[PDB]
Write a protein that binds this ligand. Sequence first.
Ligand code: AMP
Ligand code: MN
Ligand code: MN
Length: 200
Amino acid sequence: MSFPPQRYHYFLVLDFEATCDKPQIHPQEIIEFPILKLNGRTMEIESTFHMYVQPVVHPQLTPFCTELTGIIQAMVDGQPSLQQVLERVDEWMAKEGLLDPNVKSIFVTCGDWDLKVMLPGQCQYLGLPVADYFKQWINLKKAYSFAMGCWPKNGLLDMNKGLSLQHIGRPHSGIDDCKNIANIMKTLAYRGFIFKQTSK
Ligand SMILES: Nc1ncnc2c1ncn2[C@@H]1O[C@H](COP(=O)(O)O)[C@@H](O)[C@H]1O
Ligand SMILES: [Mn+2]
Ligand SMILES: [Mn+2]
């Protein structure tokens, strides 16, 4: 087969960037919140959510963080905080039609960190409830391992290598990481893979 029927109407590709430092800052805070809505059958990008987020606990970005992500201070200054961004996300979900119980969608991330560690950890820190659509997801490294029969070593770069795909955009940009995840998904579906929830 090729581009088989999938179990979901849409895939929501997500890749946070967060405050960081050498050695690691504590706690980390989300500073970039991108979502790509993919057509569930063809994997084409149909809509994009993208907001930078103002960190509060450590409001000044370290030089390491800027070097790593490309995100400069003026991009987060004046932005809403995570709480407001999470409400913007919910409105975006509603307008996309994804809050319909008969429309099936699922988040896709490179690894488990984004939705297993980063978002629940910051939300608990903030005393915010986590929306239920953030609680199931597909780990692309785990899906790739089932599709290709091997464990990639360095996330997106090694998955692009095994699939002979040219990298899209700037590494460690949240939105560009999402596009690479989208591109890998399209190739896995081209090869006939059917995606399944991996989160426990
Ligand atoms: N090499 C690194 N050193 C320190 N922190 C990192 C590194 N790579 C990623 N991070 C942190 O993890 C976040 C997610 O990056 P990634 O998982 O590569 O998309 C970044 O925004 C940083 O906060
Ligand atoms: Mn990531
Ligand atoms: Mn990233």
